[PDB]
């Protein structure tokens, strides 16, 4: 149940969201 953040680079575009596990 662990939830983040993460901000990644797609074609130039800053793609951040969180995901959860």
Avoid: K, S, T
């Avoid at 149940?1 to 596990?21: A, D, E, K, M, P």
């Amino acid at each position: 149940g662990f939830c983040w953040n993460v901000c990644v680079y797609r074609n130039g575009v800053r793609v951040c969201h969180r995901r959860c596990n």
